[PDB]
Design a protein around this nucleic acid. Structure first.
Lengths: 70, 93, 38, 102, 203
RNA sequence: GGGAACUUUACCAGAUCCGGACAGGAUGAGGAUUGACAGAUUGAGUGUUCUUUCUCGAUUCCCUGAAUGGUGGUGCAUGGCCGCUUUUGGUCGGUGGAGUGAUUUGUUUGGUUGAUUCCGUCAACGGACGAGAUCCAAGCUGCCCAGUAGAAUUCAGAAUAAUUCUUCUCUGCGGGAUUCCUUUGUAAUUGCACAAGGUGAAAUUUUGGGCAACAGCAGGUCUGUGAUGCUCCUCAAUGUUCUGGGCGACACGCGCACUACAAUGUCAGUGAGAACAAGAAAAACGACAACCUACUUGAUCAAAAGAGUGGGGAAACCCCGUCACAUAGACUCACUUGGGACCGAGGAUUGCAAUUAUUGGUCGCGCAACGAGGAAUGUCUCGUAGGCGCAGCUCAUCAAACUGUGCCGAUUACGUCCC
């Protein structure tokens, strides 16, 4: 429910480095994670994929730390 | 007793000697030809005898003893036998 | 029933599966292939 | 003489590292092999109190094993099995098997 | 086949405990083992490998023919090997025999360990901890721990990265215990991509 | 890992032994010696011992020094291991800043979280541990797979043996879970999030565990261990004895901890009858099978027993009690058709020996308390307590113990800080 800085941080490197992950789908935005990221465990990606969609969705609200190259 | 001679002899052609510690008749050896036995309690009484002499290299683990003979033990063991080419370990490999 | 690693015949020794390891405890004696899980 | 293989070993990537891999020495070659699945797994569970002493928080260990049995079945090659098993060298603690029946 | 694994467990437990006694100063880092047919050979892992072979065959054969004579195999079914352990540093069990030797040599403690700390950390190790407990500086039941680098003590992940040894040094006046933990430079050993908390993102 | 006897055994009463390594030394013509029948000696057909001769083949025995051995002490000299502080979320450093300094900041108001967990703020910035995460088992699921798993079907047969498969089981590696939609919800321009609800086997560290920092505690262990420092013992020994016998376990209703039994008409007591469970175990070498269990005899006469056959190296096994039974069963306003304690008589059993080993063994004692428990006290919230029971561990014999599996299955809070 609360995400460790490890989930938080790595998920900020993905969104910084991948706009392949777009849809608010946890499931699409998940299947792009695990191929690109090695966390060696599923929950990490399951966490990461969950927070990675929070970031993207919120970007549409406004700016977010770790600002895009836009 | 001559038992005590061949145990000596039994180092040769064997080298390192293995004995489990029991207080009971047991023996692992005499092996190439006869392969018959002697009680360990008496084996143990022989090793200590000249173990106070440098001839022998102690090891121990679990309940087992491990005896290898120091060079001074090779030479003595040769001459006590009176037959002395040298111990098997250094004779070939 | 004196047992394997020591004179013991005490620190009652597991017969279980006939491995008799308690002398020097099955904690100190290991590499048996046991693991610590659960 | 349809032969039988019982591979009993604990360690990670042995029970697999023979039967999976090393039957393809026979599996994909002139032999015809009948694979079943590995039999069920066992655990050998001893539990000893952690204290060398008397005093404790009353705590216990649980130590375990896993023994992994695989059955793998054949028709009869003659003398090939002696060559079959001997093809492949790779494992440790894994089990060699000599069986006849039926 | 329950008890055929146990007989090997009790067996393997016997080899390791025995060699430690008699492979020392010779850098005994462990044993690997398997057998198939009439070959019980038992490779030996070690650091200092010319004292195990010996001048003329002695030490390796002197240790060979007792294992035929301990476990009763008919003569010739055993072999022996020794395997050079690459990067002598990274193996703790090699380096307790370093500490034991060094403290027997009468060294003071801090100088003793802190060297090994460098040698291991030099060797590529990712961390260390060395701890000497005992009667050092007498009448104290004084213990000391000497740390480097970085390390993980929790979870069962540690048992992969953590390979350590706890061995006694018998001094006059008492005992002095010695314990070394070390690291594996996560790189080539295991490498499961292994400390969980490191995720990577291919870019 | 305390469930015993002699063993284990430390304690007691006696008796044996060298284990006493090493030689640097006074009798090497019936040898200081080793072992001995009888006879006595003694508790002992035990040779220690005394006689009697021989059996003696030197390694032993005598004298010195050393020594070895030990459940000897000291856990307050010590390693290692263990518990505890410590169920929580804590700890540490480098450079920088403040302070003469001990020290401090980082490590924080605030919000949230089991969480020094997050976000925000920030004289701190960047890093190390602990948390988390890795792990292990349980739950739904994919692939492989079945002759040491088990279903479908047709064909014939009693009572109105061929076929194809993976539903059920097997297991290695994988899928799955995530805060994902929704609620204008609570809170809130951010944020981190929370809730009621949805999907799903699972819905909020999914569930139960294992692990687990840094400092400490004169915490426990010298009875685990050729693991160890002293310094006590060293041969009519604190050593050893399948050494002999005794204790560790005794009866002042003594005081105390934990457990099993239970007194009801809610199985309630008991007699029969119907169903159905699961983790687990099983074995022998320096010899020519000693472990379990199914079947059927023991059965023209109890029970437990005895004995013979039969395969299992473990996927040889599945009929456990709780319950169900109105089977029209028997009790029946009571210390009682409910305590099983105390009890003396037979008898079967493991085995060196049981003088209570123990028991679907009988069958006598019942009239020994006992009749919801004084203050005081224990531990948990969902397959849970409780109830029930089964193996395992010790184990030649014995579970009211612990370790684990499964069955029956609950009311109360979904809270507060009052203790």
């Amino acid at each position: 429910k609360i995400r460790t800085k490890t989930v938080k941080r790595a998920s900020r490197q993905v969104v910084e480095k991948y706009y392949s992950k777009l849809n608010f789908d946890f499931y699409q935005n998940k299947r792009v994670v695990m191929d690109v990221t090695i966390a060696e465990s599923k929950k990490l990606k399951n966490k990461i994929a969950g927070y990675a969609t929070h970031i993207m969705k919120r970007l549409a609200r406004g700016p977010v730390r770790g600002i895009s190259l836009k | 007793k001559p038992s005590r001679d061949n145990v000596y002899r039994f180092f040769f052609t064997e080298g390192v000697i293995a004995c489990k510690k029991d207080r009971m008749g047991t023996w692992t050896g005499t092996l190439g030809g006869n392969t018959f036995t002697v009680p360990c309690i008496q084996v143990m009484q022989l090793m200590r005898s000249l173990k106070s002499r440098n001839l022998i290299k102690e090891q121990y683990a679990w309940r087992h003893y491990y005896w290898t003979l120091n060079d001074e033990g090779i030479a003595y063991m040769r001459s006590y036998l009176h037959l002395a080419p040298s111990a098997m370990p250094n004779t070939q490999k | 029933r004196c047992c394997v690693i020591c004179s013991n015949q005490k620190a009652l020794i597991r017969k279980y599966e006939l491995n008799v390891c308690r002398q020097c405890f099955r904690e100190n004696a290991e590499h048996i292939g046991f693991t610590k899980l659960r | 003489q349809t032969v039988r293989l019982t591979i009993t070993s604990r360690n990670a990537k042995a029970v697999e590292s023979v039967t999976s891999q090393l039957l393809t020495r026979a599996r994909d070659e002139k032999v015809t092999i009948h694979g079943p699945v590995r039999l069920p797994t066992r655990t050998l569970k001893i539990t000893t109190r952690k204290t060398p002493c008397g005093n404790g928080t009353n705590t216990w260990d649980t130590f375990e094993l896993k023994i992994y049995k695989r059955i793998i079945d054949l028709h009869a090659p003659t003398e090939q099995v002696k060559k079959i098993t001997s093809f492949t060298m790779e494992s440790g603690v894994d089990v060699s098997i000599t069986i006849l029946d039926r | 086949k329950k008890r055929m694994i146990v007989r090997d467990g009790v067996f393997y437990a016997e080899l390791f405990e025995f060699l430690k006694r008699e492979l020392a100063e010779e850098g005994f880092s462990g044993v690997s083992y398997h057998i198939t047919t009439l070959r019980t050979e038992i490779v030996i892992k070690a650091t200092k490998t010319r004292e195990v072979l010996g001048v003329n065959g002695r030490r390796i054969r002197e240790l060979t023919a007792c294992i035929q004579q301990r476990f009763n195999y008919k003569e010739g079914k055993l072999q022996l090997y020794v395997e050079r352990v690459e990067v002598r540093g990274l193996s703790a069990m090699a380096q307790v025999e370093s500490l034991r030797f060094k403290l027997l040599s009468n060294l003071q403690v801090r100088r003793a360990a802190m060297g090994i700390i460098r040698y291991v950390m030099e060797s590529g190790a990712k961390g260390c901890e060395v701890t000497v407990g005992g009667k050092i500086k007498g009448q104290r039941a004084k213990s000391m721990t000497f740390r480097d680098g970085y390390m993980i003590k929790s979870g069962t992940a540690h048992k992969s990265f953590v390979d350590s040894a706890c061995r006694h040094c018998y001094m006059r006046a008492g005992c002095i215990g010695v314990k070394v933990k070390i690291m594996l430079p996560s790189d080539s050993t295991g490498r499961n991509g292994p400390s969980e908390p490191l995720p990577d993102v291919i870019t």
